[PDB]
Amino acid sequence: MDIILGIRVQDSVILASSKAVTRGISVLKDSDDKTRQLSPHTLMSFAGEAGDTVQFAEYIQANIQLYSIREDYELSPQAVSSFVRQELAKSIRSRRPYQVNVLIGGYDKKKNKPELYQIDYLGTKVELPYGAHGYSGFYTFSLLDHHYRPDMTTEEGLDLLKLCVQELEKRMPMDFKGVIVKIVDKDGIRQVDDFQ
Amino acid sequence: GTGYDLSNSVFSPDGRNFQVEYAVKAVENGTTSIGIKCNDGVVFAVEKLITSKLLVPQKNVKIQVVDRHIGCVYSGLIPDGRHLVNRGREEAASFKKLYKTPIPIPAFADRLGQYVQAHTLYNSVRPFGVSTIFGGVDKNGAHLYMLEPSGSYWGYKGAATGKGRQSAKAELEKLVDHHPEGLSAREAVKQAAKIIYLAHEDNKEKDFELEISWCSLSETNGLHKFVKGDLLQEAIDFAQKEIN
Amino acid sequence: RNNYDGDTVTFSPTGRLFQVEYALEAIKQGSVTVGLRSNTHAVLVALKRNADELSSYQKKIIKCDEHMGLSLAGLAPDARVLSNYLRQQCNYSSLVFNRKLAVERAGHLLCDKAQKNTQSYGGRPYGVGLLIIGYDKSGAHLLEFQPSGNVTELYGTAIGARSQGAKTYLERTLDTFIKIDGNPDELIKAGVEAISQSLRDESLTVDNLSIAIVGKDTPFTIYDGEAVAKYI
Amino acid sequence: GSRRYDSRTTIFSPEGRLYQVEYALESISHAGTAIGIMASDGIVLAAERKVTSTLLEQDTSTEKLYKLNDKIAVAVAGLTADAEILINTARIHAQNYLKTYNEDIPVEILVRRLSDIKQGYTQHGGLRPFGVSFIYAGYDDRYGYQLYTSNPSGNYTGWKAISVGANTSAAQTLLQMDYKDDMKVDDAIELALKTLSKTTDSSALTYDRLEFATIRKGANDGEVYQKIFKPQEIKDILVKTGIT
Amino acid sequence: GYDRHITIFSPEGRLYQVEYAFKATNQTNINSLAVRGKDCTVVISQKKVPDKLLDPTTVSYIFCISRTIGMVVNGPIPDARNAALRAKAEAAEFRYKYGYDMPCDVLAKRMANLSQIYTQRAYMRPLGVILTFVSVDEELGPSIYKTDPAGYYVGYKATATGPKQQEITTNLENHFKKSKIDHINEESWEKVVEFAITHMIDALGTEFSKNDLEVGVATKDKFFTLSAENIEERLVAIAEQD
Amino acid sequence: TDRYSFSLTTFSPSGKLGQIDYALTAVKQGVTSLGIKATNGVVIATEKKSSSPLAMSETLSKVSLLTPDIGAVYSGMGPDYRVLVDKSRKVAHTSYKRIYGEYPPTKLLVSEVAKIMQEATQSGGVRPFGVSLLIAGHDEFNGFSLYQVDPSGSYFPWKATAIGKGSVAAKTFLEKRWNDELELEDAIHIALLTLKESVEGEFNGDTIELAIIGDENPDLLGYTGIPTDKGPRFRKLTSQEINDRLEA
Amino acid sequence: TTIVGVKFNNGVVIAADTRSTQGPIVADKNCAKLHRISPKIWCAGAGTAADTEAVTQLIGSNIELHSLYTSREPRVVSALQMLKQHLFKYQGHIGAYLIVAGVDPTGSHLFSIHAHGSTDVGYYLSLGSGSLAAMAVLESHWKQDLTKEEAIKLASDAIQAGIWNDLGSGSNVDVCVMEIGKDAEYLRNYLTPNVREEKQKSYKFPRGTTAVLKESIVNIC
Amino acid sequence: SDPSSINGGIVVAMTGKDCVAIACDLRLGSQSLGVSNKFEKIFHYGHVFLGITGLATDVTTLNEMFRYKTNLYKLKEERAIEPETFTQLVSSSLYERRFGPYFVGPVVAGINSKSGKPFIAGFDLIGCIDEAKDFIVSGTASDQLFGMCESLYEPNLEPEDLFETISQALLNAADRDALSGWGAVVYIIKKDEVVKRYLKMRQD
Amino acid sequence: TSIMAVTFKDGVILGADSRTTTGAYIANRVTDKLTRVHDKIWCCRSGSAADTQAIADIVQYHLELYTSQYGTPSTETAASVFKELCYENKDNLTAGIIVAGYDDKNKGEVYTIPLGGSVHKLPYAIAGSGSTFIYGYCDKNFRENMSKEETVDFIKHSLSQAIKWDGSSGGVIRMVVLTAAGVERLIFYPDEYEQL
Numbered sequence A: 001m002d003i004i005l006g007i008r009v010q011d012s013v014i015l016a017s018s019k020a021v022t023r024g025i026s027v028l029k030d031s032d033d034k035t036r037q038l039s040p041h042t043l044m045s046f047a048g049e050a051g052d053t054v055q056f057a058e059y060i061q062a063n064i065q066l067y068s069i070r071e072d073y074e075l076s077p078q079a080v081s082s083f084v085r086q087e088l089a090k091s092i093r094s095r096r097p098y099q100v101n102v103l104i105g106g107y108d109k110k111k112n113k114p115e116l117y118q119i120d121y122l123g124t125k126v127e128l129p130y131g132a133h134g135y136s137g138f139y140t141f142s143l144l145d146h147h148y149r150p151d152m153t154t155e156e157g158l159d160l161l162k163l164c165v166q167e168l169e170k171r172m173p174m175d176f177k178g179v180i181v182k183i184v185d186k187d188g189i190r191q192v193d194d195f196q
Numbered sequence B: 001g002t003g004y005d006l007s008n009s010v011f012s013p014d015g016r017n018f019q020v021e022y023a024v025k026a027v028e029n030g031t032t033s034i035g036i037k038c039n040d041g042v043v044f045a046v047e048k049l050i051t052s053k054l055l056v057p058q059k060n061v062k063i064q065v066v067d068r069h070i071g072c073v074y075s076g077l078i079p080d081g082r083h084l085v086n087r088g089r090e091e092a093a094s095f096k097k098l099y100k101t102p103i104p105i106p107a108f109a110d111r112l113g114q115y116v117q118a119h120t121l122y123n124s125v126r127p128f129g130v131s132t133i134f135g136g137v138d139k140n141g142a143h144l145y146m147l148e149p150s151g152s153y154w155g156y157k158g159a160a161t162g163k164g165r166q167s168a169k170a171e172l173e174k175l176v177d178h179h180p181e182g183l184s185a186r187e188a189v190k191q192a193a194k195i196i197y198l199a200h201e202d203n204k205e206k207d208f209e210l211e212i213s214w215c216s217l218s219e220t221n222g223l224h225k226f227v228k229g230d231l232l233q234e235a236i237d238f239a240q241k242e243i244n
Numbered sequence C: 001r002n003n004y005d006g007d008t009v010t011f012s013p014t015g016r017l018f019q020v021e022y023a024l025e026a027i028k029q030g031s032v033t034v035g036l037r038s039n040t041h042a043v044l045v046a047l048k049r050n051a052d053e054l055s056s057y058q059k060k061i062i063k064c065d066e067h068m069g070l071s072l073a074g075l076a077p078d079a080r081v082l083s084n085y086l087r088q089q090c091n092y093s094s095l096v097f098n099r100k101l102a103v104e105r106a107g108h109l110l111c112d113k114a115q116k117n118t119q120s121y122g123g124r125p126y127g128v129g130l131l132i133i134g135y136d137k138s139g140a141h142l143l144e145f146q147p148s149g150n151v152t153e154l155y156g157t158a159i160g161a162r163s164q165g166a167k168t169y170l171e172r173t174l175d176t177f178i179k180i181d182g183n184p185d186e187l188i189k190a191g192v193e194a195i196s197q198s199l200r201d202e203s204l205t206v207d208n209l210s211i212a213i214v215g216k217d218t219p220f221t222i223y224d225g226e227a228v229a230k231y232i
Numbered sequence D: 001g002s003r004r005y006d007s008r009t010t011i012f013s014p015e016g017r018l019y020q021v022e023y024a025l026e027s028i029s030h031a032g033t034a035i036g037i038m039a040s041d042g043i044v045l046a047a048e049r050k051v052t053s054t055l056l057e058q059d060t061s062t063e064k065l066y067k068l069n070d071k072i073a074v075a076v077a078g079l080t081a082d083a084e085i086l087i088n089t090a091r092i093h094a095q096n097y098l099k100t101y102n103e104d105i106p107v108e109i110l111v112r113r114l115s116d117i118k119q120g121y122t123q124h125g126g127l128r129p130f131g132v133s134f135i136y137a138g139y140d141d142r143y144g145y146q147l148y149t150s151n152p153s154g155n156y157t158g159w160k161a162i163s164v165g166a167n168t169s170a171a172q173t174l175l176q177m178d179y180k181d182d183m184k185v186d187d188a189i190e191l192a193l194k195t196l197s198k199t200t201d202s203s204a205l206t207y208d209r210l211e212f213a214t215i216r217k218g219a220n221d222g223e224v225y226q227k228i229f230k231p232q233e234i235k236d237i238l239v240k241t242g243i244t
Numbered sequence E: 001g002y003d004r005h006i007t008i009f010s011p012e013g014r015l016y017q018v019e020y021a022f023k024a025t026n027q028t029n030i031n032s033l034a035v036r037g038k039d040c041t042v043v044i045s046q047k048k049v050p051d052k053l054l055d056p057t058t059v060s061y062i063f064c065i066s067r068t069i070g071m072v073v074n075g076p077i078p079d080a081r082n083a084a085l086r087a088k089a090e091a092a093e094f095r096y097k098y099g100y101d102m103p104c105d106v107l108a109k110r111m112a113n114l115s116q117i118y119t120q121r122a123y124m125r126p127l128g129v130i131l132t133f134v135s136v137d138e139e140l141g142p143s144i145y146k147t148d149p150a151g152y153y154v155g156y157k158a159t160a161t162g163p164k165q166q167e168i169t170t171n172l173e174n175h176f177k178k179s180k181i182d183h184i185n186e187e188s189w190e191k192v193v194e195f196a197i198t199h200m201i202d203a204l205g206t207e208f209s210k211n212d213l214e215v216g217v218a219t220k221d222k223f224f225t226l227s228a229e230n231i232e233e234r235l236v237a238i239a240e241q242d
Numbered sequence F: 001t002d003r004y005s006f007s008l009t010t011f012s013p014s015g016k017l018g019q020i021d022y023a024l025t026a027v028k029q030g031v032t033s034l035g036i037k038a039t040n041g042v043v044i045a046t047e048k049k050s051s052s053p054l055a056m057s058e059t060l061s062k063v064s065l066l067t068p069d070i071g072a073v074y075s076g077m078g079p080d081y082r083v084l085v086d087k088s089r090k091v092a093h094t095s096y097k098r099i100y101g102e103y104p105p106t107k108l109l110v111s112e113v114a115k116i117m118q119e120a121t122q123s124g125g126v127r128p129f130g131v132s133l134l135i136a137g138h139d140e141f142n143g144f145s146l147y148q149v150d151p152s153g154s155y156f157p158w159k160a161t162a163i164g165k166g167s168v169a170a171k172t173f174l175e176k177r178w179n180d181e182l183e184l185e186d187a188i189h190i191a192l193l194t195l196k197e198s199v200e201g202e203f204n205g206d207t208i209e210l211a212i213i214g215d216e217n218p219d220l221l222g223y224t225g226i227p228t229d230k231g232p233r234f235r236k237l238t239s240q241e242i243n244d245r246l247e248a
Numbered sequence G: 001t002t003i004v005g006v007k008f009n010n011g012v013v014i015a016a017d018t019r020s021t022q023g024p025i026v027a028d029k030n031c032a033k034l035h036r037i038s039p040k041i042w043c044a045g046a047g048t049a050a051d052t053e054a055v056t057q058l059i060g061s062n063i064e065l066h067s068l069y070t071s072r073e074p075r076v077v078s079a080l081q082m083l084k085q086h087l088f089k090y091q092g093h094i095g096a097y098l099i100v101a102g103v104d105p106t107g108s109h110l111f112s113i114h115a116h117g118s119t120d121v122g123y124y125l126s127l128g129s130g131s132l133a134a135m136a137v138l139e140s141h142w143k144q145d146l147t148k149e150e151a152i153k154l155a156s157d158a159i160q161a162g163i164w165n166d167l168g169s170g171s172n173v174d175v176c177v178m179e180i181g182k183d184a185e186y187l188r189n190y191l192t193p194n195v196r197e198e199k200q201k202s203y204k205f206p207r208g209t210t211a212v213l214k215e216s217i218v219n220i221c
Numbered sequence H: 001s002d003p004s005s006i007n008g009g010i011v012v013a014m015t016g017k018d019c020v021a022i023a024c025d026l027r028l029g030s031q032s033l034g035v036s037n038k039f040e041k042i043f044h045y046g047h048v049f050l051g052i053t054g055l056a057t058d059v060t061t062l063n064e065m066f067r068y069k070t071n072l073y074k075l076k077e078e079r080a081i082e083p084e085t086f087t088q089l090v091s092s093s094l095y096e097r098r099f100g101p102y103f104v105g106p107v108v109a110g111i112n113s114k115s116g117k118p119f120i121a122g123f124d125l126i127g128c129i130d131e132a133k134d135f136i137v138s139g140t141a142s143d144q145l146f147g148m149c150e151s152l153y154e155p156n157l158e159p160e161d162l163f164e165t166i167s168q169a170l171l172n173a174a175d176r177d178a179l180s181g182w183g184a185v186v187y188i189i190k191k192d193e194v195v196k197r198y199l200k201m202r203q204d
Numbered sequence I: 001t002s003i004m005a006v007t008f009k010d011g012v013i014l015g016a017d018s019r020t021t022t023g024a025y026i027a028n029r030v031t032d033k034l035t036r037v038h039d040k041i042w043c044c045r046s047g048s049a050a051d052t053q054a055i056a057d058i059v060q061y062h063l064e065l066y067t068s069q070y071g072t073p074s075t076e077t078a079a080s081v082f083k084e085l086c087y088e089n090k091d092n093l094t095a096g097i098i099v100a101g102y103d104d105k106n107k108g109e110v111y112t113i114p115l116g117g118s119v120h121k122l123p124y125a126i127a128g129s130g131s132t133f134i135y136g137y138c139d140k141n142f143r144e145n146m147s148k149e150e151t152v153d154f155i156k157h158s159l160s161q162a163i164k165w166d167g168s169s170g171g172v173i174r175m176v177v178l179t180a181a182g183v184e185r186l187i188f189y190p191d192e193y194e195q196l
């Protein structure tokens, strides 16, 4: 699989997501964004089988956009994640299941907390301080378990992450061509200008 | 209230279904047609009016066969009659496909019966504009039936319907009384020709072609066949001399 | 007067189906067409009707297979449905059974098709009449279809406005034309004559006359324009 | 066919009104009055039963007040049976929202769907509208206490106080005169009853002819409580308003 | 008023189409009656053959529904046959599904529920008929059950249907007031037929040849109709008591 | 071909729904039935109206068991009742027993019936039912209850009431007599009086049908061995049991 | 599982063990396998235990309804026909194997039904993993014209064969007796040969033995 | 490959005197990989408690679903559902999916508010009522639970003694299962009240 | 199983063994494989029990209905109906059926419908696993127009051999005799037929 990480610090949620897309023998691209913004303060990253990942995300996106317009209001990150889980849970008993895993990072304006949700292709959802999909957890959870504090600043979060990506570059057979990083905070969503 | 006669499944207050009654008028208004049971078969005959000399003689055949052993003939709205036979043919095929044996005539009567009665049940459909005379030879011998737009049907010794029906009915009543012992198939054919010629005299104004068929155990082998050539001629002769 | 003409599922107290009778009235208002046959050929001849002096002449003859076709008088779209339905039956007979479809059977199929619309709520009946000609395994044939469902086999006939003329002529011409065997052109000239006892205030041009013929060693084919100057 | 019997329930009059809706509203005007009043710290729902015998069982009766949800209730005016259909589909809409989003359903969202349902009966399928008007009282945390109304046309609107059913012109006027925004809930309770005293066509207003309910975030904890008053509680409140 | 044309309520709370369907039942001008023996059930029906061209053997308002159930119909034949077929189908399907022969009273109940539906739904018309079912039920003994176009049904000690129904009924009411029991006290069905014909001749004031009647008989485990000859036997027996 | 996909019950300009009104008229014309609620039971009762004395009136149940603890009776068109009983028994299984493994409580089963009735008041191509039902039952968390269901679909609970012909008279008569300390035997006594006014023919156990929702009847269970299943609370009275009481 | 059915001269009796197992584990030591289809028609199941419950509930219900419609006591042969037609429809995917016995107005009856929808009639029958032990006993002792008390003794012995010799069964013996005259008699734990001995020790803990991080009171209200 | 063994987890319930107890581990796994220690598998609907082991997506879904149905139930019966009835509900709801089922092992516990009886029950994945007064177990260490329970349990434990027992039964079983542990929670249920405790355990 | 039907002068006789096996276990040693579908039309069942019972139950239904409407059906009609079920459902049935009956027009008739649903009318027919062992014996001993007692013997001896050799056949021998006279059931026990 590709790399899908996320971490919830004190005032925001950081999503790190691999840039490579490879089709068998060649690496087709080294600059791919594995996220969609679902609403101004809600970000979804994703990974899994080709086509399915994007189709699914863009469908979730349009649904949340529809909701926002209709109610002139932005759903809580908790609600978005329950909606997404339910969609994935329908997929599994469907004729052709969506094979997609996602992380949802949001800033909840009403409670002024950041929230991270991990949901796999079966509809298994869980709220966590840090998470990952596929093998990404295997390399990085050791380090997060050790270093994570709930009161970390965004800067600390980004350091702790830098360390995680280094561990992945070192021990992981695949060249995932770096990561794109985004931050979701009370003022919305922005992308870290460079992960050098 | 009034207008009990505008809709088809409706009972008037005297208990009646006026649209079926009106369909009978469409029948009374058709040409004459008849059935005669002989004592191993049956004979059908029908007056074909000749509108014009431009009709091709021989060639507008009004008697229809069902399966191999059943003849139908009908007076009234001709396309309705044809529609009814198409149904009859599906029914006989289904019955035979499942039960192997060609459909027994009573069984087949009730098939038409139920389908016709069915068109008096609903206002979204219109009753059949024909009386149908039919029959053939089953494993219990010969049977002749007649079937009205209401889905009433019974067995007959003879039967008639259309404009000529009263002169024909009177004439058939003769035969019954003046042949209590039964009538042979070949004699029943000639009588049928006579009876059509007699019933034609309601509207001599028009010229007509005669058509006859028979299903007889000995003569056609329990299969339904049209009468033609010499035998047809011989029965038209018998009809000419019986007029003078 | 006449609550009984509101649809096709209603019989009148005399026993009539008014909606059907009103459909037959569309035919009489249509432009005239004539059909006739010998033992070797069958011929349609048709008078086409234009709207303006600026307009086309609506075609009245439609080919249905190599051995069969028809002319229409009345609601044109309706002929288009029926002729198409027929093309399919001619086709189905060829593909499945490798058999040219007999004219008698096409007759019966059209009858059964029209009859459907006259027993069911919601269906109007067809508003067109048709003359069909064909050459099949028993030689030349001509049929007249009415939207009541009645089809009748004839040596000749006509339908549409003033057709009573062409029909009376055919009744008298009968024994002349019935024997125009192995002669396509004579039989056409005898059809064109017929169709003339039917024109009021206009005569046949190159633009308004169409003709079709079929028979032994001659597939159903249609002449118009220059092709018809020959006989006008 | 059967289009003769079809009184077309979905058409416009030449003025552009929908016959059947107008007529259902007429129907509703003869139903028991119902009232909703919203305070800054709660909501009151009050309604008048259709004159009820002395033998009727008033404890288990629930003709006009219904729980949709732990946080939303309705007062009905019109056909009870029609309403219970609607109530029930709404209870389910709430559950579906709750199950999809793990969040209780916002009041408007519910009201809108239920009104969208009534609207459909008004535009397709030839059935008769639902002869019901609804007052909805609810709490959510996007707009706190809320009060809405809907009728057979599918239209809905929000209110600080409102009535449906009998004598609403009269009752609307009287609230308009006495409502103030700072209003506390026990003020609203009192106002609700004054209004029905004046409004009722029956010469007295007694406990056995009322249904009554409140929605309080009161008292200590931020949670919301729904109370449907029993006969004895309503009698007490009537003494305490010296309306008895 | 279209409340006259379809099965909806008049302002009096009435279904005129149902009323008019009852009226149609009498169109044949046939009377019928049924009675119960010790272990049989008999039905009797007039048989009229106005036309000389009809095959008489085909003219019947009595049906063998199943091995055990007989039905006689008061009303026009097309509707009779439609109801016959239906009941045949139902009785056979019941057996297949539940493993035993469909009982008279249950079949009556079912056929009545079908009628009830035509009274409630608009595109269906009621049938113009009255069905009288008879059997010897294995649980209930000889039984008679009657159904009409209202959707109504009840069991009977004995019963009669048709134009002259009233005459026949009062005649029978009287007989049982005397006899004090609900059945003909007779072992043999041949004499319960005799009773039935007799008590009918007296009520209609009219005499019968062998071609004027139809008879049906339900014994335990068979329902059958009689031929002109087994009837003739009965008419001779009656005549031996002048 | 069901063309009739439109309502046959519509609003008149005055706000009436004629067909529901007319159904109520059919009910009013029907034979009197009634029900009354005691503390340890409920009784429902009506008059058998033998159409011939040749008919066997035992074969006409006007009073029907719906579940072991719930019974019904009606005024109006009996056929409409017969098929509502079939329908109600079935819905008690499909929409309750098959799910929760216990029979529905009285009020819920009444909703279901009411609902069926409403549907015939609004759906395409049908008329409403021409009956009113009184339904009586017992369930563990609500105890004894008595409901009336009308053609409109509306229902309401009662301490006692009556429907059909003599109902205004009888409702008056029941108001005099009903108290909240009535024991079941006493309510039966009253039911019999209240019926007796409304009837001038023979009045006894053969012309009267009557059932109770009472104590559980283990003698009517059919099996023994499960101490947790006690009999049905519902029971029709015998021709005898009735006459017995026509002494008091 | 061991279940059997034995006719006697005035009726019929069925019996069953009380063990139910998931693989080699015993999930329930006292499971009741005797199911009622209607008061005088009972049923015992083997196979998938969710399928035998489901299908006895369902047919029980259709029977009750059909009984109410017909105003007749329900017949065994109806339970039989309804069961078999449903099992057949599902081609054996409903893993229900049953012995159904009862009394109706036509007399007393005993049938078995296999998952695919075949049925047997007999005077004595067994099914389940314990089937062959039980049948050995029935084949050894059954005689015609058993009295009731002999039939119970016999059916009880047959199940014991299964309990002892089969690992699929059992613990106790349940019995239902359906006699033509009477109410059906259901004897839960008619026989209980298998009581656990007192343990060598009590394992009640001293309180406070367990480590804890949090207490909350929980909201029912 | 086995859906009942991907996420892991256990639930056990037993009865005491006028009380019942019910408990679960807290581990959400994904095979070898521990994912969460805050996956409670015990839910409640009024005073009825439902433990669910098995595939976690389905645990979640079923809970969402029984919350939905017990909501509609309360709204119509105007009273909270009792355990005997809920059990039937669970059972019928699972058997609706007979040929495509939810991969779970439910357990019901509660006290009937009318009768006062302690009640517990369990089921297979297609919904056969495994009904037992003493105790019920479910999950990836159901074997080890059966063992602890059969030894430890004795009937009629007072609430504070029942707690000690069920706690021990759970912990020592989870410790012999790779795929359970990571914390644990125990509900003790009496007629009028309920106390919920988190247990200290090993984290490996 | 072993089953046969044989036409003789006065009508026709059907016989069968009475054993039902599931592998080597004899599930039922007193099976009735002679099954009535009309008064005087019966069949012999072989193949799957579920399939043949279910089919027979349907045929009986169809002929009950035939009878209600058209009177008594021909033995040929009954074979048509079996055939139609067997041919049209060949992909999920394992049923090998012999049909036999008597009427006055035709005396005894025997039709056999093997797997696949072909139908075959014959003077006699044999089937079931046990039949293979007696093709020789039967072809050698059947003659047309035997008496009843001759025919009961021909059957008794044919099936005693089929039983002797086939493990999936055994128990009692049942017969059903079909003639103008009515319907006679017969039974023969081991101590009789083993000894032949």
Ligand SMILES: [Mg+2]
Pocket: A090, H061
């Ligand atoms: Mg789902």
Ligand SMILES: [Mg+2]
Pocket: A092, H003
């Ligand atoms: Mg799966």
Ligand SMILES: [Mg+2]
Pocket: none
């Ligand atoms: Mg004119």
Ligand SMILES: [Mg+2]
Pocket: D085, D089
């Ligand atoms: Mg709706």
Ligand SMILES: [Mg+2]
Pocket: D096, D097, D100
């Ligand atoms: Mg939703």
Ligand SMILES: [Mg+2]
Pocket: F220, F221, F222, G039
């Ligand atoms: Mg009993």
Ligand SMILES: [Mg+2]
Pocket: G031, G032, G033, H129, H130, H131
């Ligand atoms: Mg159990």
Ligand SMILES: [Mg+2]
Pocket: H065, H068
């Ligand atoms: Mg759901």
Ligand SMILES: [Mg+2]
Pocket: H075, H076
């Ligand atoms: Mg409710």
Ligand SMILES: [Mg+2]
Pocket: H096, H097, H098, H099, H100
């Ligand atoms: Mg399924």
Ligand SMILES: [Mg+2]
Pocket: I046, I047, I094, I095, I096, I128
């Ligand atoms: Mg085979």
Ligand SMILES: [Mg+2]
Pocket: I085, I089
């Ligand atoms: Mg099949």
Ligand SMILES: [Mg+2]
Pocket: I001, I046, I047, I128, I129
């Ligand atoms: Mg075999």
